[PDB]
Amino acid sequence: RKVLVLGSGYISEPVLEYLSRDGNIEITVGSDMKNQIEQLGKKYNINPVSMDICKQEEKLGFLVAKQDLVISLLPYVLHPLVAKACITNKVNMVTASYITPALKELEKSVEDAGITIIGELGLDPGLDHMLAMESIDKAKEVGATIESYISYCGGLPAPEHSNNPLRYKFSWSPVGVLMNVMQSATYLLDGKVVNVAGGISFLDAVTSMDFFPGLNLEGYPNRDSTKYAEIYGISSAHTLLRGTLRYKGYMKALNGFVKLGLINREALPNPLTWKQLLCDLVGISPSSEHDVLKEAVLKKLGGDNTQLEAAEWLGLLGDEQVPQAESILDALSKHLVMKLSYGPEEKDMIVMRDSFGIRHPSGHLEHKTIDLVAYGDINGFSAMAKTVGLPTAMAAKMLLDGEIGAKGLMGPFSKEIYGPILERIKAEGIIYTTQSTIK
Template structure:
């Protein structure tokens, strides 16, 4: 059996899940687990007590410290802040490693595409939950359609109903500061064939935030999540759909609670003076709320991705829905968000080093990553896709 060595940089929540999954793969012989925090590495070793795991205390931006891992690995998974991913992607290409991350692509990734292809390695951003699983589900649903009328993508990482205590009905299964940054990120949608720009301070506004019903959960608040246009481009659907958008979901009341906070400036980055010190309002809010938003040992989160496509197949109007709904595994303690992000990224990394994904250069999950490879592996881990197709009447989708 051929065996492989891989590197995971960043062993927080998602990195821990990725290492956990990789350690269970018989052909993954060694996993360099890299973090700048010694306590994070100790926690990882306690959670994943495998002889395969080689901890490395190093900064993601210190090439010399990372060199033992870079020289011996075939693939690298970066689960770090955006500022560190550029260097990691650059070193992956230089050392001939496949590169994976679970976030939106940074500009440097595009600049490295040609060099990666020349080195016969792949750069694969966006293989987490959202973006990631949503794109693979979309890939499945869009295949075989003659035309697309509506393409809506919904993602959620929220407490299970029994753990959704007021007033926020939200807890942390990702980076809390990352969540708050997303709460002020401008968005673009397509409505009635027109591109709609949503400013970062209007995501939760009445009329922008809508209600979406998921049968297993009931009605949820849906607010715009980022820019749909690059994904329409990847799918070959730019200027060809009537409605399209990417949305995050929260328990009802979330938008009504957060909209006045945003309007009051609590998420502003511009510092204010407090007792002679410059303080960014959003960081103050983050520090205030963060200790109150942790899950208890027996509380579950849920992770949801739901994709709805309306279109035509063989001239017949059809509505297709694909959904993944996962809950925290109380046996392992891994959150649903860890499973759907960390496992997905680990599966893609392993598939690259094994040669199951053959593309080189910059790969986009929507068009370049075989959905069946990833979704089959997730099903083996108990994370299953539910799909349905039904007729629809043109005019009912919006």
Template sequence: MTIHWCGTGLSSAPGLRRLAESGADLVVWNRTVEKARAVVGDLCSDIRAFDADALRDALRPGDVVVSMLPGDWHIPLAETAIDKGTHFVSSSYVSPEMAALDGAAKTAGVALVNEVGLDPGLDHVMAHWLMADYRASDAFDPASEHRFLSYCGGVPAQPNDFRYKFSWSPLGVLKALRSPSRSIRGGAVTDVARPWDALSSYAAPLPSPESFEVYPNRDSLPFLAEYGFGDDWNMQEFVRGTLRLNGWSDAWADVFAEIETLHGPEGDARLQEMSDGFWAAHAYDAGEPDRVVLCVDLMVGPKDAPVYHKTFVLDATGDARGSAMARLVSVPVSLAVEGAAAGQIAPGVSTAPRDAEAVAKWLDVTREQAQHVAVVDHL
């Protein structure tokens, strides 16, 4: 069984290192072989120029293909995996096109595993842990008020005036700022056109309490079922969102204002130009530590007298092992690769694990990758 890891961007090395140290048979595919050698040459001797046809020819039944490539490659590689009888792993969200491959993957007996990075990924695992803990408690009652929050963000460990730094191309961040969100607030579905229209403050229960600016992103509602909240549950709040340093909205006010004016091909061109400028001005310097903060919170009962309230918190900074973002994206990917290779993940399209044994393993490994991981009981 061979693991075919495609893409060696900034978030690949720690996961690759973990697989290499376990003795896995690795082939690394990258558009530029020289760049891949510079990043992972000490981990893998078999580095090849990425080519879809060459990859297809190299795949054998039972292999695993990992896509750390741009999102438009996920579907073609997943389709190739189905045709060749190999498993597929990606850290990205399940797209409608990926979901549509579920039946074919089941027929082929292969696992198409997605949402196994940081966010989405570890946030799912923490949510599954909290839900299992709550269901096993005396407080469990679907009729009670339920409030669920999940906020994650990569922020500079050494705050700057821009209140942010980029781990990879800023284009994705800028595009996300143009996207609407859907969540539950005050017991009602809430649609927001732009993130800055829904900014609020969140007090993270870290060892030294710290507040952040937060906002909902994407459509949170499909994750109600993903996490096990029933249609008949009393949901007062359900938000999956992004976390930023205090002062971020002020520092980015001009960015927000310009994004509002961008439309059509000319707007896309300007967005790319902005991305290039931000990458030049606000990328991490070599060796500069980044920081990742993730908080997943479940409160049950009235706000002033909850019967259950716990928060899973993670705080990590870059160190000699690599950036915090790289560790917390690619190490979970490596766990999914191991699970798929061992036949522990059912055929079809799936996301981060929810069974107790796998959740426990993922959280144990996560504790090794972050400086602080804890469950805070507020009662």
């Protein structure tokens, strides 16, 4: 009944609140951040520990032996270090992030150790895995087959907080999401593989998602949906696509940041200000403000007043000081956090949308759809925290209660895992509906 959490937050908060209910569980936490680990203990009774997991890899190995289960809420790159520690002392482990190729190399040793580690728990990957297999397995019970799979998912603010140039507010640092735009996308549609190039041209792939007439949504392909054929066992499928959802206008705005050369990891150049910074990118010398206006709009290409005003609104033409950063993209990410973050009483929400083409032995075709929508609680957790934290927090409790008997690495792909979790999240306010027709 002893658990060690690695990572100080903010995903830890709901993880602790859930595990720390019966009171018969001892919680321990370890983090680099000193102020964060300290403030956390004020809310939940736990044992604080301060440690850089990397350097003091020694003290980690010993403490792992004292715990029943470790929860890794650290960046996904540090996971192999927690795996090598758990296998040594034969302790189980749960992780919210992907199972990287690095960590995949231990499956033999992790199996020989005779313990279980579970990865890919959370909103994505996680619930998207569970909703997928829940429907595939249901179709197998009746001998049916999967011909198509389409899954769109996105975290965004509640509609009443969408009135800003990006129609968005960042739960964490934008570096990750901003860099995603420069990457490709790969999916299968009607038998033919489709490749989408990232960067300036990605805007061409944005579409209108109209399954909620009251909601103004856009969507675009995610990163490589083709790999999921082997994971779910639906290689027979002729359409396989995962996508992302945002409010209309979000991507076109990010497209402006690309035109201006703001999305890159080049190092930065009296304190430096945004007006001065963009004069450099524009190529002009630091001049009056109305001048860079005509120069920025000229680099924004065409009379793109929308993208221009958006940059003005964010103060990118003003005299505000550019925050200290290791690069230009890192610098922009910090300015957006300052200008577009959630207030204390501002709601977020989550939206998932799945679509299956199921072929039954009779020969007919079932069109099955799933809707999952959750809002953040004002005085409670956000919709992102609840969806990322609970699936991994619930999986941990399941092991400590011996509910999971499997042995290995696995994901949430088995009914032994996704079954219980899918039912227990309803009580927490995560509800999903279903619909079907036949043709």
